[PDB]
Amino acid sequence: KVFGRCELAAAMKRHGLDNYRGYSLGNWVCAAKFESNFNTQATNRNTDGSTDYGILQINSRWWCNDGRTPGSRNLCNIPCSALLSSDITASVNCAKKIVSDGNGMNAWVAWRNRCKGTDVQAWIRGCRL
Numbered sequence: 001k002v003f004g005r006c007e008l009a010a011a012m013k014r015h016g017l018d019n020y021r022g023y024s025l026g027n028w029v030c031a032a033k034f035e036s037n038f039n040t041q042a043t044n045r046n047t048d049g050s051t052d053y054g055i056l057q058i059n060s061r062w063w064c065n066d067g068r069t070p071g072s073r074n075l076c077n078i079p080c081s082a083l084l085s086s087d088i089t090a091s092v093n094c095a096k097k098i099v100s101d102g103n104g105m106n107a108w109v110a111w112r113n114r115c116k117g118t119d120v121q122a123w124i125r126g127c128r129l
């Protein structure tokens with residue numbers, strides 16, 4: 001599923017991501033924009049053989065099981081395919097674990113490089129929330 005900007009904002013809010021660990025909703029929308037272009041089915045293979053999955057490009061090295069990332073963990077206790085669903089629940093639940101793990105949203109390199117320090121409220125501006 002490819003979300004609209006305000007549509008994703010609303011779904012993230014419903015699932016408790018707004019201000020989660022102090023990160024306002026626009027941070028999460030900005031991160032999803034640059035990680036996946038709002039596409040739940042996005043996947044990208046990393047140089048190390050791990051893969052990033054879903055709207056927030058969660059990595060199989062640590063967070064989900066895809067069966068083809070040796071030595072990896074599955075800290076969200078989910079198949080990586082669950083992160084590709086039209087329903088964002090699994091991605092949100094796992095993102096909550098990630099952002100709680102010490103480095104906040106810096107875990108998402110696109111957030112650090114393209115969202116951090118910017119006017120992230122612009123991502124939810126105009127949306128009925």
Ligand code: NA
Nearest residue numbers: 060064072073
């Ligand atoms: Na894994």
Ligand SMILES: [Ru+3]
Nearest residue numbers: 122123124125
């Ligand atoms: Ru804009």
